[PDB]
Nucleic acid binder design. Structure first.
Lengths: 63, 50, 128, 66, 214, 195, 102, 148
RNA sequence: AGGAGGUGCAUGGCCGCCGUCAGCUCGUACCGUGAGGCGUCCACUUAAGUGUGGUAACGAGCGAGACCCGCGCCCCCAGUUGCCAGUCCCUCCCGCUCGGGAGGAGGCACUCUGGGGGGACUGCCGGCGAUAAGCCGGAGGAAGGGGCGGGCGACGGUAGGUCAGUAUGCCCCGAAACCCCCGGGCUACACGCGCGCUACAAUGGGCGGGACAAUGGGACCCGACCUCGAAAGGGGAAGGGAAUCCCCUAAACCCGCCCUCAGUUCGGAUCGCGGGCUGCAACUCGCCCGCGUGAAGCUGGAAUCCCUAGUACCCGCGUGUCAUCAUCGCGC
């Protein structure tokens, strides 16, 4: 199944709260921003974080 | 008359250094060790799991 | 023009230049390959392409590895890419992908490793 | 061969003991009951809009009891 | 090699196998029209990812499927009338070139003996050998009962085509009469609804029993 | 044969390791390293205390300096003995120490818990101690005392953790001890830090 | 023209890359042409063995691997360039073998 | 044209029937009573079986260049029935091909390069490509596509 | 001392299955006098105690997952792996003079080689799902919805087994239950059952032809090449301590001829002879070279095992201990 892992759900919300403006719907921009704003060495989990923060950014402007 | 006869072939010619087992002694490039001994020492030889 | 082709374990290197139309596998005419199924497999890309492309270019392809059928399919992929790069027109690409997919996508499938408990008969094989 | 083809529309759900029988709704495309919708079963894979051949239109399957 | 080269060159104008361009073929049964693949292709083999596709079987050419269920025809729990139908001498499995050759020969036999499109003969046989009712044991509270069930077009195709293959194997197995001759004879019998064929016979058997399970 | 050479060198190495384990058990022999050079073969022995290794006036190590040249055939063995930076970070050395403590008629619970505390305040992230055998009677038992974070699977378990197995001898028989020590410097893959 | 062929082998990849990097710095510092390090095929020694010590249980087998990577560096003759390679600190795992070819 | 432009079987047949003429090629006295290889289980059916071998062997020299006894053994080898054990692959005989190569050498179509094997002389190449041109022309007016 | 003498309810360690199943629990809070319970429960969803949404609990730890190996495309770097990639030049074989083929120099394309980076992320759309989690379909694309083959198997239990590989309590023997040596046994056979190899011929056998692999190994070793013997084998020998010399042939495949279906132009068990290899010696106790002979079996009931994508099935190959014992195991 494709249930997103909890720790990424945690860090994604945190990075959402502290820079609400530094992440936009563009996937790749968010990918780079989380690349540099964290110390992740596994590119895959970086992509996971990017994919989820995309969805959170989408969630924002409708509510 | 107590010395064991020389043997260049066969199982009796071969004996593990560690435990002395006459049987399974793998010889990939000349380990000279019993097979069961190999399990507890393979990482010490550098072998990994993949 | 240079092209390559991957399939199973038969890998083909192909070079296409201007010529009368001769097409050679390992420097041998494509019409005299002993298996006929391999002949059609090698031949598939230039039937539907047309006769003018057939007689307007000389193509030399060398295939190493795998089986004869795999060699045929790798030569098919190589010659397909050869016509692709030599002609460089969209319509041939469209009809290439319409007839099938392999010659523009390859077959990246391989043979999975064998696993113990009667590994010899196959990976997923076991005893009774 | 007195058969009657009919067109699948909606799939009620996997039925039978093992779920290998699939319950669908079919519209009779030809015959004495033209246009009539019947709940009919399908062994083997089926989709929407398949033409299934009937020997008897009168036979029907009971509603799937959950 | 002269027949080999001439058969290489003849389908240069896009023909299934060597001959028998598929435009002239007509499917009479409405059920199997959107499933029988009539795309014109020179060679009936794609090595495709059809198994991993739920509905990718409709794309496979009927002749490729024919070679497919020919190569698998050997050995089974089917002790039909107490026989073990195994290929011990260079079995058909994985030797798709030999199977390719045998379908080529049987197609030539069909062409000559019937004087018409062998693909169309096969189409008629497929229509004529597909059953239209099976039986399923459905229970309520552990009281099982046999209920007639309608067959999907694709399952009908599968069972009928397996049946003709098994008829061919029953004919050739343990006889002087070759496999190509067996397949040609079986397909011509099934084409004209001949009960002598295994395919039409077992279509009738599948229709029956389910006939009485109402 | 480069293979036959590397395997030969590492076989010499682990045989020396086992020989020193059965020689230097009282010394808390923790680690080994070997450097070849035209001058000779330098052996680098990290022990819980080199004071016992040096012996009396070097009469101990000199014996070893003979031994490393005769049974293993090392040309010019030069012995160097050093201290482990934190023996509480070596599960092997801690295991040997606790086995020796148990052998001294010390109660298994009290010794194990004191050792656990002593390794913990030394900064080890996570400590597990498993004790098996005749611990309170003829029928054997296995009891595990854990504390902290001890990821027990994955590559990190095979990489960052320090592991130690020991056997302790007593009148009733043999007791098996296993010790797992997480050094603090390691970090988890799922731990993501933020700036 | 005279050349020196050097083969550097190690189980550790990082030790091998460090040795190659310092060789490269030496060769470019002495201003002597060097053929780029060609990574030759890595040897995979494989040993499988049954897990169970005795004969009991399911047929279980364990796989043990040794990946040893070797690289080839060819340099042109310069005695100054060859003087600095014997001073290269070589790790205990890396084996460097040097031959001279005309 | 070259041998590459024709089937191998026909070219072997043509070279065998043509080398039937030359007095150099002559089966030895032990040949008819000795099969081709150890792996073979039945004697060769026909009596031209010697000539075909030469027509094969020389053809191999047209392609593999320097080839000695052992590699020609390797190519000719085949599967053998071992009884209740599985069938296994084995090699063919050696003295037969050694005598064939010696007869070719005395004929001047092949020479010996020591340490590498035996190579094909210019005369053998000219004969083989003349045969190939003739056969290519034959299958050309049989199959016009070969004029391409 | 030694025990291969026993003692696996005397043990350590180890392996198996429950079971890579989803579980095991702890800190404090809450209910119950207590046994103990909660967290770990319920609707949905996941391959999971993975989560979603409500819960007297909130967090934590072990577990799955993440983690690591390899396939899937490209890029870079590196090119002595490999090639008339473009190729003036030299050597050669033909040819319709149209052309086709091969090597030395030279080039490094491309395969390969082996280090790093990108790329695949429900990344977007439609439908579902309470708008949540998440699910299905679609688009693009070498590969999207645990991408794919694997490794990492928990708290505990089974006195499972293993002290006969190792340490090892208890007891037993101390010129035997200790040490050495010769021969036999480890193969003994009217028998029941398990697992594997051959076979039950025409789909096929004989003759010859063609294009096809990785696994790994190679110094008393791998061995081209040359010579004798039909062959097993005898004698010499290049190169090689491993992208460079050998194992290296590919098999299946089809192609032209012979045979024309039967216990046999299948099948070889099995019985004897001459020769050959390892070993001190191979009848007990090896295989191979040739001959003669060369069995049943003709598809096999009751009962019953496994598999789902390159996967079944079929084919063929290196290697494990190693002269051979394997008709085995792993890997290709």
């Amino acid at each position: 199944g494709k249930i997103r892992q909890g720790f990424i759900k945690r860090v994604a919300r945190e990075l959402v709260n502290k820079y609400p403006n530094e992440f936009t719907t563009d996937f790749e921009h968010n990918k780079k921003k989380v690349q540099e704003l964290t110390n992740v060495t596994s590119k895959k989990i970086r992509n996971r974080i990017a994919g989820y923060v995309t969805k959170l950014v989408r969630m924002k402007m409708e509510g | 008359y107590n010395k064991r006869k020389p043997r260049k072939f066969g199982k009796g010619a071969r004996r593990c250094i560690r435990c002395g087992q006459y049987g399974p002694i793998i010889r990939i490039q000349g380990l000279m060790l019993c097979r069961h001994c190999f399990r507890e020492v393979a990482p010490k030889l550098g072998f990994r799991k993949y | 023009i240079q092209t390559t082709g991957k399939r199973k374990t038969a890998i083909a290197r192909a070079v296409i230049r201007e010529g009368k139309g001769r097409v050679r596998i390992n420097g041998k005419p494509v019409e005299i390959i002993e298996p006929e199924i391999a002949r059609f497999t090698i031949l598939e890309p230039l039937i539907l392409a047309g006769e003018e492309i057939w007689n307007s270019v000389d193509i030399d392809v060398k295939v190493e590895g795998g089986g004869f059928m795999g060699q045929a399919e790798a030569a098919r992929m190589a010659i397909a890419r050869a016509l692709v790069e030599w002609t460089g027109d969209m319509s041939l690409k469209e009809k290439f992908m319409k007839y099938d997919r392999t010659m523009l996508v390859g077959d990246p499938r391989r043979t999975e490793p064998h696993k113990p408990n009667r590994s010899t008969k196959g990976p997923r094989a076991k005893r009774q | 061969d007195e058969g009657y083809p009919a067109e699948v529309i909606e799939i009620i759900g996997r039925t039978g003991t093992t779920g290998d029988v699939t319950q669908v709704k079919v519209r009779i495309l030809e015959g004495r009951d033209k246009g009539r919708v019947i709940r009919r079963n399908v062994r083997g894979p089926v989709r929407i809009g398949d033409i299934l051949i009937l020997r008897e239109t009168e036979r029907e399957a009971r509603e799937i009891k959950s | 090699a002269k027949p080999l080269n001439e058969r290489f060159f003849i389908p240069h104008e896009i023909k299934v196998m060597g001959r028998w361009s598929t435009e002239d073929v007509e499917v009479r049964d409405p059920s199997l029209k959107p499933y029988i693949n009539l795309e014109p292709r020179l060679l009936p083999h794609t090595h495709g990812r059809h198994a991993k596709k739920h509905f990718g079987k409709a794309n496979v050419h009927i002749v490729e499927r024919l070679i497919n269920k020919i190569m698998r025809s050997g050995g089974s729990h089917y002790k039909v009338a107490g026989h073990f139908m195994r290929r011990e001498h260079r079995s058909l499995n994985s030797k798709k070139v030999k199977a390719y050759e045998v379908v080529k020969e049987a197609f030539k036999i069909i062409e000559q003996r019937t004087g018409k499109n062998p693909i169309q003969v096969l189409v008629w046989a497929i229509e004529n050998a597909a059953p239209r009712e099976d039986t399923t044991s459905v229970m309520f509270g552990g009281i099982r009962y046999h209920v007639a069930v309608d067959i999907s077009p694709m399952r009908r195709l599968d069972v009928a085509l397996r049946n003709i293959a098994l008829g061919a194997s029953a004919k050739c197995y343990r006889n002087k009469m070759s496999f190509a001759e067996a397949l040609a004879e079986e397909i011509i019998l099934a084409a004209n609804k001949d009960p002598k064929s295994y395919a039409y016979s077992k279509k009738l058997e599948i229709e029956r029993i389910a006939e009485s399970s109402r | 044969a480069i293979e036959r050479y590397f395997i030969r060198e590492a076989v010499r190495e682990m045989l020396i390791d086992e020989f020193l384990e059965k020689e230097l058990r009282r010394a808390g022999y923790g680690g080994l390293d070997i450097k070849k050079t035209p001058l000779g073969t330098k052996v680098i022995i990290f022990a819980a205390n080199p004071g016992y290794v040096i012996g009396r006036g070097g009469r101990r190590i000199r014996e070893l300096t003979r031994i490393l040249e005769k049974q293993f055939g090392l040309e010019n063995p030069q012995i160097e003995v050093e201290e482990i930076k934190n023996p509480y970070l070596n599960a092997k050395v801690q295991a040997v120490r606790l086995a020796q403590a148990l052998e001294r008629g010390i109660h298994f619970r009290r010794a194990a818990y004191a050792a656990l505390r002593a390794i913990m305040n030394n900064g080890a992230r996570g400590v597990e101690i498993r004790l098996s055998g005749k611990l309170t009677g003829e029928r054997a038992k296995s009891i595990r005392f854990y504390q902290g974070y001890l990821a027990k699977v994955g590559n990190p378990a095979e990489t960052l953790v320090s592991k130690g197995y020991a056997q302790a001898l007593l009148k009733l028989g043999v007791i098996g001890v296993k010790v797992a020590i997480m050094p603090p410097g390691a970090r988890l893959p799922d731990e993501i830090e933020i700036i | 023209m005279q050349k020196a062929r050097i083969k550097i082998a190690s189980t550790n990849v990082r030790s091998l890359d460090e040795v190659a990097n310092q060789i490269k710095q030496i060769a470019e510092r002495t201003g002597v042409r060097m053929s780029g390090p060609i990574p030759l095929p890595t040897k995979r020694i494989r040993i499988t063995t049954r897990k169970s010590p005795d004969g009991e249980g399911s047929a279980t087998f364990d796989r043990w691997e040794l990946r040893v990577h070797k690289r080839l560096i060819d340099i042109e003759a310069d005695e100054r360039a060859m003087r600095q390679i014997m001073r290269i600190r070589v790790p205990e795992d890396v084996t460097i073998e040097i031959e001279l070819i005309s | 044209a070259t041998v590459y432009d024709v089937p191998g079987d026909l070219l072997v047949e043509r070279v065998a029937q043509r080398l039937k003429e030359i007095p150099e090629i002559k089966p030895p006295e032990w040949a008819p009573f000795v099969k081709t290889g150890r792996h073979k289980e039945r004697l060769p059916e026909q009596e031209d079986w010697w000539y075909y071998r030469v027509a094969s062997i020389l053809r191999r020299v047209y392609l593999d260049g320097p080839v000695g006894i052992e590699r020609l053994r390797t190519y000719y080898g085949g599967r053998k029935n071992r009884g209740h054990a599985p069938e296994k692959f084995y090699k063919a005989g050696g003295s037969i091909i050694r005598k064939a190569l010696q007869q070719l050498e005395a004929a001047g179509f092949v020479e010996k390069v020591p340490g590498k094997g035996r190579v094909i002389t210019p005369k053998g190449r000219s004969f083989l490509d003349k045969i190939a041109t003739e056969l290519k022309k034959e299958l050309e007016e049989i199959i016009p596509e070969l004029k391409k």
